[model samples]
Target: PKVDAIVIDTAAVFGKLEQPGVVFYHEKHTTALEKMAKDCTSCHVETEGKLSFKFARTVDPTSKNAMAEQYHANCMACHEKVVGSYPTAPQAAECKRCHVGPGVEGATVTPKPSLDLNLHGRHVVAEAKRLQVKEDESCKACHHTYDEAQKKLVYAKGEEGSCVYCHKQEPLPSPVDRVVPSTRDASHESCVNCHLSTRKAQTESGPVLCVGCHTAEAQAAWKKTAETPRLFRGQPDATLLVAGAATANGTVDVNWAAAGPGPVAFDHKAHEGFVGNCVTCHHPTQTGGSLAACGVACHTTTGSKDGNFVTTAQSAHQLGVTTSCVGCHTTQANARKECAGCHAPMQKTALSQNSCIQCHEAGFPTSGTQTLGKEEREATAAKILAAKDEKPKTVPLENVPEKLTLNYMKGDEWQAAEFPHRKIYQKLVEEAAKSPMANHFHGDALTMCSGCHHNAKPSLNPPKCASCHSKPFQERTANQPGLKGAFHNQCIGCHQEMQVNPKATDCQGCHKPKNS
Candidate 1:
């Protein structure tokens, strides 16, 4: 019945286990302790003036038997002591009481909630108020760089990045004779400790309880402002991304001979609000600093050790990588209801030269001087940005067909469906027109028509669905769905995705029964 449950598994340290791991309700135990005058220190010990997350121990015991013995002794002994007051407590000498059997319910713990942009902004404001400093300077409270020489974390301006960039999922060996803690441990140590210290001062502070930050309901209750304040870091409004164009100043140092494709005008300001954090695009570089440019010393043409063998081009254009431009946009498009109706089933095709020019515009040159000035670069980008179409162009309402009748089924139980061709087309066009992303990617005026037209060329007189999706499935058309199947799948799928009326179950809404 707990919201935050944890599987007390020691398989990683103990090799193999004989008994099934216990399902420990962390929040339940924390709440129970709160009833008394005790806190986390009752179970967890401290090391170097910091609370160690380990149960009643500063460090993990090396021996497997020692670890097991410690758990049994400490846990059962406490239970036995508390049994007089707490009747429901598990008594000692009951082997199966703690070492539970297999298939325990409610063992899955609620995932710890992340610090969203709005909450982050709140922290920035609060920290600034406490420290009596500017909001930007308050970053020093949490953000720090590990100094190799001094062997301690030190705050540096313009060097702030994600904690995960260094902390990672698992501990890593460090030169300073210490293992870096997991991201989970790092966050708890930083956030929880801060909360505890703040509360100890008798001031308004954040939650320290597990359920407060981990439970779905708790996270949902967090206050979100209408406009999340933008983080004030040294970031650009827009930048021209070109291979072998990294320069000392912000201007492009073009090695025109080695230039690939064309420079893409990256709208950095727009993307900052879209992603909410720097770490989304500015991932780690060779020197462990994420603020450095990708194609500079890392992510080279032939790939560098610092880049993790990822080519410079792939760094921005890769399909699956979260940081990639194309990947992020594609993921966003597939998520939106207006775009997903067509994009859901569509496979990503290689962009033709014409399609490539949408991002890589015509003004960009393959051959040029060694340097392109900042003014020229910004001006060119502005022009390209201004030239983009903000609304979708479609066939006039007068030219669009009013209705379409399908009468392919001669001996069918259902009559021909009279599809409201104009209404559906109008809706799609209206939806697509609302999004600038749709307007840019939709390409030609009739690109939306290709969604149902299948293999046919997008034109005024496109071929009927029957042309490709024939009644008889032959070797050539084996992979292709039949006309009836195609119609049902496409129409029904679109309906489900767009959440339109007359869902897939309402077959009679589209197909009427033939007269007896």
Candidate 2:
């Protein structure tokens, strides 16, 4: 059965509870509180003019005993207060009434409201209008963090992290815990409590009821604020995390340049567009708590020599670290089958001086990442990248083959696949020709053809995919792809890179199906 209750489980913070955590019914408490002429304040404290859902502790009760005492004092005391009035209300003496052991049967998990950007934006606007304050100031009210000097939570103007992120930036992936609430607790306290307060004030507010929030219908009915005013907290259109070369100093990676290639040129907005949030890259931030530009307080140039040994290069280059520039890019590229085809069999290549210039190229606007401010270098690099002025001049289309018949994989009943060879070839040509970046890379005939036709000797038919990739699912060397895998890798792989269909089962879409 559906009930207006919430599961009180704080495993990471409190450790496993001795008894099953309480399934607290909000309706019972609200109705109980109403009779006592009390409100949310009876069980919760008003912090930042809103309730904190953490039972009675405004701050996290760190020890298990403290938490037990807090819950027992507030909850049981209240239950004892109302035990005579409501006979159905469980008595404070019986632990089983609330703290049923774990694996309690028939317990339903209620969905919590998503405090997503859409909801955040709505709250920002609504609160701003309601309080007659600036939207930024209003945003600050519901969002605050503990200030050390005052030793209390306060809204730091100009520094506000997205709600969930702010609370969630706990030390380490585990929890020592702090005043900051978890996403569920934060919303339960701030959002629902505020809604109740507002409605009591004879003003309209958001939902205060559980079903009003934690239900699919409620969530679906809530109009997603698409195209709402962009929540601007001094975010840049482009923030270059690290500035690359091509500055007035020049692009040749010799002389002063050392170790690996060039300093990376990061396009912050471009990266932001790709990821979900800042913490998606930056592990955490000290300021209102999420994400500051390119490891703001995190990865230092000389490293967080606090003996944490977090090297600067490790921040941007560690292969498995998704936030790192190279790591994320490698992941992104390899997933593209075109990139994967050549990359799968290749061992990890060490950064070499020869291939180094690719990163800190002369074409980039910045001359030296040596002396400029991180943001300044980023700004300069951004302009260079944004310029996009160069175009590639592709070789004549007639120089390539028109239609290609891949008889490499002959089915006894079905004929070979009639590939739209020239059509795709021309697209690559156009792409290369349109951008000087692509054009310069695929400059020569041998180089360009090798993207598909591997060891090229200049003829459109230089080498068959069959020559190297002969088996459908070869098991021998396990280095190069098998024949069918190779052809599929080449054709479908390229199609995937070009964002065409990759599902082989869309068989008819690729080549004609089944019939001879």
Candidate 3:
């Protein structure tokens, strides 16, 4: 059953009014309009393909008197126009004609509408057929990229972002010049206009009635399309990313062919799904544009004065910031209860080469030349990545020390604090074993142990605690902690970070008092 009425409260649009909100039966009006053969375009203003809901104005007449007057003029004129034809038509000589108090029969409002990828894909497909273009090329019909230098919308290759990302649910002030339409207006104008237009052309049409989109059933009834395939706009499946730091003289379009670490063949498609949203990896720097590689416009080699004096390498390799490769993966590791079990206990490090080479696949080509062309470099990286076995064999957990007795310094008050050394080692290794990220980095199992026994060579007999943290309270450097402080900080800090007795503040928690 469809809703028959809506409460029109224009308090927000026209400040507080004296009258109670008008009870309007939309179904009643629509039925009358259909009976008289009055099209929606008669009342709505259509510009381009978009239909505006503001009564008679192509743009909204948003002022208090303007809105009030338009409603009176359109609504009364319609009621009066039909009076001669139908004999029971209403006229606005009486303000109470439409403004009947809330006691009207079948009084209720339908829910508002929203959009999703399914609808987007539907429109894409529909437009493609209409324009006789490739399914992918149809993206340009709606999706656009803002070219900062060119100062206009451009549909750049591989650069299409969702309208919601920029247009927003409500308009807010930004450096971006293009006015983002309010969610309400954009839908009415963009959706309803095209729908009405298509109907006029005898093409397949969508809903034009108020209930068509704004009903709960419409969303459910709208058949959602299956796994929306990766939207194609000339993105490569895989490419070797061995390019040097790109240097921009100014306004995009720069020269970047140069010196860097050995070529790394990156599987672009693999990362596409891995990152999930392309916007996560390639963020749009300029307003209304598809995202490109970070280095293309930002984080230049020399760090442009306008680009915030940060190098592309720095932005790309930032340790734990969101959006950077290391940062995003690090954030992935920090997700609750899964990857966090291992990564949480440890201080994040510069990605280990055992880890870097997993992606970087460095020192390649053994191809006999000191330098090679971009084509040759990429080919060699692909070959190198294919040749190597990065995965390592898991070893016995028993090899890890069961416990490390904290007895290096004598003259201590309490007995040596027994560190559950190997227990934690096993836990870290077990956690690492579960993560492909950890497994790649911890090829030598001791590499996992290095989080705690850090800054030392990877060996069974690593340096003692007192080696670096020499003194208890005296002779400690500015940034260095004393022995007791260092021990407490690392042990307790790990506990807090790992959320194992995170609020444990008592010394008795770690050090047991002898029963006298």
Candidate 4:
């Protein structure tokens, strides 16, 4: 089912269609055309040296009749001509042959397009060679900002960000009266146009055809490299989100900087590859200038109308916002099945007193916000992050029980399930150790335990499930399941999410029936 099929629904633009739209197999036609020694020009038209993606006509026809007539004339003529040579070709009289209905089974699904770090690196190298410039200097070819004065997009060094910042989903008229193209139009026009021109010049280049870039094989080939080279911008190695970095009036509060809970140390270099581009976190500026710090320039400590009433902390810590630090991590956690087993049901809450210092490095703003230069600040931030980036602590191996008898069922039909307590605990610790974010958050010895023994104090001997959920329902606490229900839900739910061997319905996998 790797077929790239296009539903040819010409009447959709006019209104509801009389018949189910034709399920056009794009590759089939392309192959048939190639067999006949014909190419794209046979089906598509070109204008001003650029190949139009439309079929036969350069622009869309005005009315439904006009569109149908064009399709019939172009399509049936070719089919009638080919039918004599190839009998399988549908004749001009066969209308139902073309209108085959929507969503044809076994049709190929095209992969979503992405210019990942590997492909970006490849383009960087190719552009550098073609433009006769250094690899780093080749960014200007694609990255640009719209200038109001010139009314054109111009590239500025160090101001490169994602194209998504300006080119949104729909065309919008800007302040200068220029229509900003949609992201799809912008991408296709720029990328396909570049590929077409490059191919015409007889230079080594990427594909100009839709299937070439849309197939999973092409993407896999692009990402074959073991490591993708990091993009170079004048970004810092590490930085501190200092409290009072910028106040309501956009001035640093020297008094606040030297006191209280300390600043959050961020390892910028480590995070560069973690995101798709700089615009993932860096707030865009309209002036076509350098990347501006969010907290320092745009999103201040106090809320602003320009920042959509979001404060600096809220911008970075806000839940459900992909651009926020916590939101991004939470999203990733909920995506993977192994991680989601424990994280999916977890509720968002205010970080405790102890949890605050995990991100905000302790004893910061040392000796009163010293007037440090750029290098000094980077060095200070690097030191703070490096110190806290060690392997997270976990409870002693001896403390973990080998097995626990889940006798909560209290039934004569089956024996108690022997839970592999130590095995599961070790696996959780091992998985948590693999991620730096998990290590940072689960720094305490008993923090991992809180994943299951939630709401109870983090300890080796945390209170049992019966203590919290003594019965199936308690007055004003009906949400809490009984001990038996809690055990089944927590165990089966985790197994289901993680996709473990014993499924939720496999009762005999965990328990054995007693002899009658």
Candidate 5:
């Protein structure tokens, strides 16, 4: 009889010997191969009306030569063939495309089941009625044993192990034999052959083809097979040891500043839930103990591999990594639409010591202050008043001048342009209205306008852009763009960075041509 036509299998197969089946996504390979005019022979090894489910040749499972040959021969050969016919096809022999293994490439395979009790409960509940012989027969159906003496398979109770334990990536010999079978051989002999034989006998059977399970859409659907039951694995609902909390371990002495009352009582548990996963902060380093240990090492002043071994102060407030306090808050700034417009241009790393003290207050016992205390507050208040005194009292519309001279390219020869200060101010007001975060951080409508009028406080009239940016690239400063470029760079750059609506890069969006 002719061999059965190969078809893709979606359901993963478990090992008969005490291990869960490694989910092989068959559909992905089938569709990918079909597009290339190739079929199962590209990767499978067929023998005596049976095909090996493992990828490539079956000689040496761990041999680099075998893997390289299989992938390059099968994948690149097909890609080269297609590219030859259709030169425009995306057919580069990129290593990352395949053999980076599973999910990273090959159509996003779902992660192998971790086999926690929750998953186990879902399976048990679904198959409870269909189970034959005993209530737990469903489990026994998948778990089996190798009878070394008889050289046959048998079912064992309470002695099951992970399928990966025996049917590893490389093939091993049957316990009865001196030579271990290859992983591909073992898998095909147990999984594909068994499923194929059962299907032939007209029984409800699992798939044995490549396209049965391994596509992006297929994996997503499979995860919804059953509601994940809450597993009772004696896991604690709460613990004193927070997920990412690191202890000082008394390695370095902490010198508490006399000016500050005490370190803020950080709610470690609250942050854990907020961030979702412990790995978010405590990753790369396994230990999750005290803040000192976690920060000093990981965010170390020099930045080490372990603990990141820097200073605790730097880690808590560094502006680069989002895991840091300042970085996290800076990220929050982007989440707010209004604040993002202006704040997006302000460098998160440009924060001053005073800014740090804004959040990390000095006086404790009393509710932590987000502002400077009485003495410093008085000094800041006086400084603000003095700065306000230096501002221009007022400028009439004519005195403010409807036009400003542009000196770009040629020397100053009356390249005057109209200043639409009111129009620009109105636009700023409208932009701020749409952004709640911008409204909060801008303090008032005037502060939002001050991003462009750096030296000027909120006012109906402000100095021209040319006032500060006098020359188009001064001798000592090649870094600063010329007056016109500077305005466009800041304004246009902010709009683009914040992704503001009605985004326009054309010059006409902001200004008319010199003659117009």
Candidate 6:
């Protein structure tokens, strides 16, 4: 008989059980049971005042005979009575129909919530307000410690471990001699019991079903909840481990002119706040240490076997990886409104030594021995610092010749392609406006223009390409393109190399195609 009620199995009823329960459609069973005039007493056995829910027999606990006799006698007897008269009714002999695992047809599995820190925080906050307890106290209400000596659970302030910490695969470990609850039981005890108790007290609470916390839809909804402030016990802001080296110490005095500047006075704390975590810069390089020492192994000058030539300077500034300086800076570029466009394409490869002085200028020397004097060191640091601010000036547009005719011997005549001197100058100026980092490193707009121009003097404009590349290649290598192609290669190649934007690829966007 098909009834309108749902037949929830033992797993669902107990709610503390680790597995899912079978939900037999009550309406489907009741309809069949009704035609035979059978009532709840046919399947449900009476125990105490209320009805005890059982699939088979309640009287006989261990014997399979009871289960077989009860199911066959009650269900089949009724089915046989109906099947004889009603041909469309359920068959008495079909064993697979009831035990096919999925009791009801066409039932869909629902989604659940993930127990992440964010979701846990939300629950903690909500429960605290409802219970009228201190915010931190709510955490202690759930998170508990096991007393090994007493063999009982106890709460410790500021020392509560995660639920999973105690309730492991086989419960709590030995020395404690107390068996821990299974994961499912522990979760139900903490989550469902609390919710059910709250609801019985006429307060709002969470769902008890597995789908409440483990479903995709529930997770998406949980994400929309307000984020809670993170908790922290005493952690230091920053610290410096290495003291300045004395002048007399035999460490090789860096040639300020050659390397562009002396070593930098790195701002460790500033960088830490700039990046959210210390691991952002320190990790995968130096572990468990605040200050990393500079040696051949870590930041190698010549490149060590252990380290991949990622010098102290390069290690900090290399892009792509999360630990590198340029990598973090590049990541910051995405967040900032300005400076993202050009920095987006800057390569992780080594920057020019001339550009290094901007950061690595020598610091104040401690009182000491045989190297450069304090006065001289100060002077060198000042010079390097001043050099960083120096900018290269551009020559007047009129100074650059607008057109040039090249004559490289008669038989092989090369057409003098008109140089768009004014147009090129304006384009370089506009491009320079896009990147402040490029501007700081290049010194001026004209310096970037010289990437292709290559002039002996620092001028706004220089002579045409023909002045230097006048002679044609007599024996061109198989792979190498000719001189004209070489000049075009450098010009076009640089533009292509640094061009990150999809819009930059359209040749017609920058230069017109050849006439024929």
Q: Output the number of the lDDT-best candidate.
A: 1
lDDT of 6 by residue, 295-338 (tens): 42355555554455666556766766667655655565533433
Query: What is the Cα root-mean-square deviation between model 1 and the actual structure?
Result: 3.7
Better of 1 and 5 by TM-score: 1
lDDT of 1 by residue, 226-268 (tens): 8898775666566677656555565667776566567787677
Candidates, ranked, lDDT = 1, 4, 3, 2, 6, 5
Instruction: Kindly give the stretch of ten consecutive residues in candidate 3 with the minimal lDDT sum.
Output: 248-257
**224-320 in candidate 4: lDDT tens per residue?**
3577888766678897666655543324544444545666778898887777556667644342323566666567667776677678778877877
Alpha carbon deviation, residue 221, candidate 3 (Å): 20
Q: Write the per-residue lDDT of candidate 3 for residues 1-516, one digit (tens) a residue.
A: 345555665534556776656777767767767776776666667676566676666654658777777778777776666677777666656767667765432312455555454566677888999999888778677666567788787786554665555665456344374466755556666777778778889997788777678668765787666765565555556555544433332122212234335445665665665554465565534434354545555566678654466676666677867767678777777764435644665557766554665556444443332333445544554565556546655546667667766765433556667778767766656665666556654567567566667776877677876888885555756656767766877777667666775245766656666544
Candidate 5 all-Cα RMSD: 14.5
Regions of candidate 4 where Cα sits further than 4 Å from its true position: 1-25, 47-49, 57-112, 145-155, 174-178, 193-221, 245-251, 257-261, 283-290, 348-354, 364-377
Provide the lowest-lDDT 10-residue window in model 1.
Answer: 103-112
Model 2 vs truth, CA RMSD:
8.5
What is the TM-score of candidate 6? 0.37
lDDT, candidates in the order shown: 0.74, 0.58, 0.62, 0.73, 0.47, 0.49
- How badly does each model clash, as a count of residue pairs? 0, 3, 6, 2, 41, 25
Which ten contiguous residues of candidate 6 have the minimum total lDDT?
Answer: 234-243
TM-score of candidate 5 relative to the true fold: 0.44
Cα shift from native, residue 63, model 2 (Å)? 11
The lDDT, on a scale of 0 to 1, for candidate 1 is: 0.74
Q: Which prediction has the highest TM-score against the true structure?
A: 1
The TM-scores of all predictions, comma-separated, are 0.85, 0.58, 0.54, 0.81, 0.44, 0.37
Which scores better on lDDT, 1 or 5? 1
Candidate 3, residue 367: Cα displacement in angstroms equals 12
